[PDB]
Design a protein around this ligand. Structure first.
Ligand SMILES: CO[C@@H]1O[C@H](CO[C@H]2O[C@H](CS)[C@@H](O)[C@H](O)[C@@H]2O)[C@@H](O)[C@H](O[C@H]2O[C@H](CO)[C@@H](O)[C@H](O)[C@@H]2O)[C@@H]1O
Ligand SMILES: [Zn+2]
Length: 1016
C-alpha cells in the first residue's frame, strides 16, 4: 500500500511555508550575536551527574575550484593539507579530522606510495580521519538536478568503499547557498542516518534557536507517515569559521583560532588577538571559552555540543596543526580537571557527535521536532539575498543539463553488453561521470567561480561530452549490426551525434550536413535512441544538402517529412537591424521518429531529382518594412514579405497561438470553440543600485522592478509547415522563437547580452490567471513546492531556483513553464511568471569572488509552455505544501531534459545494418522512469551485475483514462538473471533479496535501486 502524496496533509511541528507566513524577518542588532540575542544560561544546569559533553571537530573546507582551478588548489594547498593531516594524525592518536570532498582525496591517495596508503587506511580504520558525506563534491542544492546529486554522491562513495572500506552515514554541508529537502531524500535512501547544514536565512536561525528547533527530523513535504525523515542539525550562527562556531560572541571565539596571532598573516577583525595558552592564563581563557560553549548549548536540547574547528583550506602548515592542537590540548586538560565547569571536552568527529546525541535521546533526555520544507532563498545579512546565482553563468547551467542526459544515455546504451578492456568504455564513462560530478560543486553550476575556473569546468565538460559520444556511437554500432559481421575499431567514429539544441543555432556552427548527391552518395542511414522506458514518437530534424529528400524506415515504408530552410540571424552592423538570412545550399528535414522503450530505430534519407511524394515544404513569411530579397537555392517555395502584423498559427489539431506585431505570444486557444486566453510574453530589464550594495555573481540587488526592453520595430519570421511551424523575432539581446509541433509550444531564446553592463534580462509571462500570491517551483527536478510571494520581503527574496519548471494556477486554469536549464524566477504579481535569462554585472558582491560577471557568452535557452484546464483535476488541499504536474507538463519536461538522441552513420555504406533494437522492452507507465541503468562489473567478472535507479513521479488525476501499460521488471531486461536485489541508491549495500528475481515497481514520489546478477 503506497502512501497518498496528494490528499493527506502531513502534521509537522515546523512547516517552512507556514513559518515564513508568520515570521516578521526583522533585522535588529542583537548585540555580540548580531542576528540573535544575549544568551543566558542557568549555571546550575550542569553538575557532576549531568555534564556538558563537548566535541571539537577539526575540519578544512576545500573548494574543488573557485578562485583557482581544482588542479591549482590541489598543487598549492590541498595536497599539503592531506599530507600534513596524515603525518599529524599518525603522530597524535587523540587528534581527529573530518574530510568531505572525495574528488581531492582520490586525487591525493592515488599519488601516494604504498607505505603511505597503508598509513592512511589505518588512521581511517581507527577513526581519527573520518569521511563526512563522501560525495565527489559538496554540491550546490539550488540548481543541481537530483540525478546529478546522486551521480556525484555515488562517484565519491564508490571510491571510498573500494579504497578506504567505509561508507559515511553522516552528511556535512556547511557551504551550499541555502538547502534543499532533496538532500535528505537521497541521503536517507542511501543509508544515511544524520545530516548537518549551515547556510540558512539569519531570521530562520533566530526563530528556530528560540524554540530549540535547530535539530529536527526533516521529512518530505508530502510525507504523512514520516518514513523519509532524516535527523538534521542546523548550525546557529553566521559562518562556519572559528569566530562563528565556538559560541555567540565572535570577538571571544576569534581568540580561540590559534592561526590568528600574526605569523600566518591572519588577524582578528574584532581587535583582540588569540594568546598562547599557558599555566598563568589557562584559567581565565577556559572561563571565557566554557562560557561561550554553555551559551551555544542553550540553543539545543541535549547535553552534547558540536564545536566545528576549521575554515577554508585550513590545516595546511605543520606549524598550524601544532598551534591549534597544543593550545586546545592545554584547554581540555584544564577544563576537564576543574569540576566546577562540569564539562568533558575532546577532539571528535561528526559521527561521534551524532552517536552521543542519539544516546541522550534514547536516555529520554530529549525529543526532537519534525520539519518539512526548504531553506531558500538564503540571506546572510540585511537584504543580501543570494538569488543571483540561480542565473549566473547560464551557458554552463544549460551545459550541465545537456551533459546530464548524455551521461545517462552513454551509461544505458553501453550497459547492454560486456566490453573488452581495449574498448575503453569504462575509462570514458568514469571520465564523463567525474567531470559532470565535479561541476555540481557549489562554485561550479552556481556560476560563482573566477573566469579562468569557469573555463576549466567548461573544458572538462566538453571532454566529457566527447567521451559520451564515443561510448554511445560504439554502442549503437554494436546493437544494430548483424553479430557475425560486427568488426569494431574502438577508435573509429561509426556515427556522429547530431544535436539541434546544443550548443545551438547561433551559438556554434557545429552540426554536420548530410551530403547527398547523384555523383557522390544517394542515401544516408540515421538512428534515434530513446532513453525513456516507454515508446516515444518525436519530431527529429537533420541538415541535408538538398531539399529533395525523402524518408523511409528500414522496412522501406515512406515516412511523412517536412523540409524548411536553414535560417540564421545576423546583427547587421551596417543597417543596425537584426534579421535572418537563409542558406542556399543546406536545408532542414523534419519527420516523426518512433522509437522503442530504451531502444533504437533506424531511418534512411534518400535524395531525388524533384519533390518527393511524401515530403512537403514550409512556407516562409518575413514581416518588416523595407524588406530585401531572401533567395533559397533549390528550395521550391519563394519567401513572402509583408509589413509587421498580428498573426495566428495552428499545427495539427493542437492549440491556436496568436502573436503581436512584434512576434511575441499574446493568446492561446486550446480548442476550436474556446476563449483566446491572454498569455503575453514580455522582455524586461533589471538594473543595479547606484548607492549601497551591488549585485554580483551571488547577490541579486535590483534597483526596483524591471523596466520593459525597448523593442523598436523588430523583424519577424514566420515559417508554416504541416509538421512544424514557428515565429522568430530578433529582439535586443534575444532571438526569441515559438515553435509549434501540434501540442504545447516550445520556446527557444538565443540570449546574447553583449556589452550591456549592470543589466539582468528577464522573460515574463502575463496572464489573467487568479493566482494571487501563490506559485510553484521545483526542487532539483524532483518535486514541486508551493511558494507564497511575501510583500514584507524585498523583490530579490521572492526569487527562487527554477531548476526544471514553475507554474501558477487558479480554480480553472494553470500555466506551466518547463525549462531545459536552471534559472532564477518568481511570480511578482497575480497571473505572472518570470524567469531570468542572463545577467552582466560590473561589480564584485563582497562574498570572496573578487570580480563581477563580465564573461557572458551566447546561450540557447529552451522551454515548453503548457496552458491547461485544471478544474477537473484532483489537487491537494489548500493547506498542502506540494503541487504536482499534469501528464502533459511532465512529458513536456521529459522532452526538454531527455530528448531522442540522433546519430548519423559516418561511412558510405553500413553493412549488416538492422532496423530496430528494444522492440520487446516493456513500455512502462508514464509516471515511471529508469533514471539510471549502469553495468557495475567489468568483463572479467564471472557474475555480471547491472544497476537500475527507478523513479516514480506523481501526476494529477484529471479524468484521462490513459490505459494499458506493461509492468516493467528491470531485473529481467538482461537475460540469464540469477539474482535480483534491492540496494541503496548508490548500489553499495544490499537491502532485500527479491523473490522470483522480480524487481517491483515503486510508489508515487519514491525512488528505488535494484541490481540484477547474470550468470551468462
Ligand atoms: C565570508 O567570506 C569568506 O572568506 C573566506 C576567506 O577565507 C580565507 O581567509 C580567512 C579569513 S582570515 C581564513 O581564516 C581562511 O582559512 C582563508 O585563508 C572565503 O574563502 C569564503 O569562501 C566560502 O564562501 C563562498 C561564498 O561567500 C563560497 O563561494 C566558497 O565556496 C566558500 O565556501 C568566504 O568568501
Ligand atoms: Zn566552498
Amino acid at each position: 500500500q503506497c502512501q497518498d502524496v496528494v490528499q493527506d496533509v502531513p502534521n509537522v511541528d515546523v512547516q517552512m511555508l507556514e513559518l515564513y507566513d508568520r515570521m516578521s524577518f526583522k533585522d535588529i542588532d542583537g548585540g555580540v550575536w548580531k542576528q540573535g540575542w544575549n544568551i543566558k544560561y542557568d549555571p546550575l544546569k550542569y553538575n557532576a551527574h549531568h555534564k556538558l559533553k563537548v566535541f571539537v571537530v577539526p575540519h578544512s573546507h576545500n573548494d574543488p575550484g573557485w578562485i583557482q582551478t581544482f588542479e591549482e588548489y590541489y598543487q598549492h594547498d590541498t595536497k599539503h593539507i592531506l599530507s600534513n593531516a596524515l603525518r599529524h594524525l599518525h603522530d597524535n592518536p587523540e587528534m581527529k579530522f573530518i574530510w568531505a570532498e572525495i574528488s581531492y582525496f582520490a586525487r591525493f591517495y592515488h599519488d601516494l606510495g604504498e607505505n603511505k596508503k597503508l598509513q592512511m587506511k589505518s588512521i581511517v580504520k581507527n577513526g581519527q580521519l573520518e569521511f563526512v558525506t563522501g560525495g565527489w563534491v559538496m554540491p550546490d542544492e539550488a540548481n543541481s538536478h537530483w540525478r546529478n546529486v546522486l551521480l556525484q554522491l555515488t562517484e565519491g562513495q564508490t571510491w571510498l568503499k573500494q579504497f578506504m572500506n567505509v561508507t559515511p552515514t553522516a552528511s556535512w554541508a556547511i557551504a551550499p547557498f541555502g538547502h534543499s529537502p532533496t538532500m535528505p531524500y537521497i541521503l536517507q535512501k542511501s543509508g544515511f542516518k544524520n545530516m548537518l547544514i549551515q547556510r540558512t536565512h539569519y531570521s530562520v536561525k533566530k526563530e528556530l534557536a528560540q524554540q530549540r528547533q535547530l535539530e529536527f527530523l526533516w521529512r518530505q513535504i508530502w510525507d504523512n507517515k514520516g518514513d523519509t525523515a532524516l535527523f538534521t542539525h542546523m548550525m546557529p550562527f553566521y559562518s562556519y569559521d572559528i569566530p562563528h562556531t565556538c559560541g555567540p560572541d565572535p570577538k571571544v571565539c576569534c581568540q580561540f583560532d590559534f592561526k590568528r596571532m600574526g605569523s600566518f598573516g591572519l588577524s582578528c577583525p574584532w581587535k583582540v588577538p588569540p594568546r598562547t595558552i599557558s599555566d598563568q592564563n589557562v584559567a581565565a581563557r577556559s572561563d571565557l571559552l566554557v562560557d561561550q560553549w554553555k551559551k551555544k548549548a542553550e540553543l539545543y536540547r541535549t547535553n552534547v555540543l558540536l564545536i566545528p574547528l576549521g575554515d577554508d583550506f585550513r590545516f595546511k602548515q605543520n606549524t598550524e596543526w601544532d598551534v591549534q592542537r597544543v593550545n586546545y590540548e592545554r584547554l581540555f586538560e584544564h577544563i576537564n580537571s576543574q569540576a566546577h565547569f562540569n564539562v568533558q571536552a575532546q577532539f571528535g568527529t561528526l559521527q561521534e557527535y551524532f552517536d552521543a546525541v542519539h544516546q541522550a535521546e534514547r536516555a529520554g533526555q530529549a525529543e526532537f521536532p519534525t520539519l518539512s520544507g526548504d531553506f531558500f532563498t538564503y540571506a546572510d545579512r540585511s537584504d543580501n539575498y543570494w538569488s543571483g546565482y540561480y542565473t549566473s553563468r547560464p551557458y554552463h547551467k544549460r551545459m550541465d543539463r545537456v551533459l546530464m542526459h548524455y551521461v545517462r544515455a552513454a551509461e544505458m546504451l553501453s550497459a547492454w553488453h560486456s566490453w573488452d578492456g581495449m574498448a575503453r568504455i569504462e575509462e570514458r564513462l568514469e571520465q564523463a561521470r567525474r567531470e559532470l560530478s565535479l561541476f555540481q560543486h557549489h562554485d561550479g553550476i552556481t556560476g560563482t567561480a573566477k573566469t579562468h575556473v569557469v573555463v576549466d569546468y567548461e573544458q572538462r565538460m566538453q571532454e566529457a561530452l566527447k567521451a559520451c559520444q564515443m561510448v554511445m556511437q560504439q554502442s549503437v554500432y554494436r546493437l544494430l549490426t548483424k553479430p557475425s559481421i560486427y568488426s569494431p575499431d574502438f577508435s573509429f567514429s561509426y556515427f556522429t551525434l547530431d544535436d539541434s539544441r546544443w550548443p545551438g543555432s547561433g551559438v556554434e556552427d557545429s552540426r554536420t550536413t548530410i551530403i547527398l548527391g547523384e555523383d557522390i552518395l544517394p542515401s544516408k542511414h540515421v538512428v534515434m535512441h530513446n532513453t525513456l522506458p516507454h515508446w516515444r514518437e518525436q519530431l527529429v530534424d537533420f541538415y541535408v544538402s538538398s531539399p529533395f529528400v525523402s524518408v523511409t524506415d528500414l522496412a522501406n515504408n515512406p515516412v511523412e517529412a517536412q523540409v524548411s530552410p536553414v535560417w540564421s540571424w545576423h546583427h547587421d552592423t551596417l543597417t543596425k537591424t537584426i534579421h535572418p538570412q537563409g542558406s542556399t545550399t543546406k536545408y532542414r528535414i523534419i519527420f516523426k521518429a518512433r522509437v522503442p522503450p530504451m531502444g533504437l530505430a533506424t531511418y534512411v534519407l534518400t535524395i531525388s531529382d524533384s519533390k518527393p511524394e511524401h515530403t512537403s515544404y514550409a512556407s516562409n513569411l518575413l514581416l518588416r518594412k523595407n524588406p530585401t530579397s531572401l533567395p533559397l537555392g533549390q528550395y521550391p517555395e519563394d519567401v513572402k514579405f509583408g509589413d509587421p502584423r498580428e498573426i495566428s498559427l495552428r499545427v495539427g489539431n493542437g492549440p491556436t497561438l496568436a502573436f503581436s506585431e512584434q512576434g511575441l505570444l499574446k493568446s492561446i486557444q486550446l480548442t476550436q470553440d474556446s476563449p483566446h486566453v491572454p498569455v503575453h510574453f514580455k522582455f524586461l530589464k533589471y538594473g543595479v543600485r547606484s548607492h549601497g550594495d551591488r549585485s554580483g555573481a551571488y547577490l541579486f540587488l535590483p534597483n526596483g522592478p524591471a523596466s520593459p526592453v525597448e523593442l523598436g520595430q523588430p523583424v519577424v519570421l514566420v515559417t508554416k509547415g504541416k509538421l512544424e511551424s514557428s515565429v522568430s523575432v530578433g529582439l535586443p539581446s534575444v532571438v526569441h522563437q515559438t515553435i509549434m509541433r501540434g501540442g504545447a509550444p516550445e520556446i527557444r531564446n538565443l540570449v546574447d547580452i553583449g556589452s550591456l553592463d549592470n543589466t539582468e534580462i528577464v522573460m515574463r509571462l502575463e496572464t489573467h490567471i487568479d493566482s494571487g500570491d501563490i506559485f510553484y517551483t521545483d526542487l532539483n527536478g524532483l518535486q514541486f513546492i508551493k511558494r507564497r510571494r511575501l510583500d514584507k520581503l524585498p523583490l530579490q527574496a521572492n526569487y527562487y531556483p527554477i531548476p526544471s519548471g514553475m507554474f501558477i494556477e487558479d480554480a480553472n486554469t494553470r500555466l506551466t513553464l518547463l525549462t531545459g536549464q536552471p534559472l532564477g524566477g518568481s511570480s511578482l504579481a497575480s497571473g505572472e511568471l518570470e524567469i531570468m535569462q542572463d545577467r552582466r554585472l560590473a561589480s564584485d558582491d563582497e562574498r570572496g569572488l573578487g570580480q563581477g560577471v563580465l564573461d557572458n557568452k551566447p546561450v540557447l535557452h529552451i522551454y515548453r509552455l503548457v496552458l491547461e484546464k485544471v478544474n477537473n483535476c484532483v489537487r491537494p488541499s489548500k493547506l498542502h505544501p506540494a503541487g504536482y504536474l499534469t501528464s502533459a507538463a511532465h512529458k513536456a519536461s521529459q522532452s526538454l531534459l531527455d530528448p531522442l538522441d540522433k546519430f548519423i552513420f559516418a561511412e558510405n555504406e553500413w553493412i549488416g545494418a538492422q532496423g530496430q533494437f528494444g522492440g520487446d522492452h516493456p513500455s512502462a507507465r508514464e509516471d515511471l522512469d529508469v533514471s539510471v541503468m549502469r553495468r557495475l562489473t567489468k568483463s572479467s567478472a564471472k557474475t555480471q551485475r547491472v544497476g537500475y535507479v527507478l523513479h516514480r513521479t506523481n501526476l494529477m488525476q484529471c479524468g484521462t483514462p490513459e490505459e494499458h501499460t506493461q509492468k516493467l521488471d528491470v531485473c529481467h531486461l538482461l537475460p540469464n538473471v540469477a539474482r535480483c536485489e534491492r540496494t541503496t541508491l548508490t548500489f553499495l549495500q544490499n537491502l532485500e533479496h527479491l523473490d522470483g528475481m522480480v524487481a517491483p515497481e515503486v510508489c508515487p514520489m519514491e525512488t528505488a535501486a535494484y541490481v540484477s546478477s547474470h550468470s551468462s
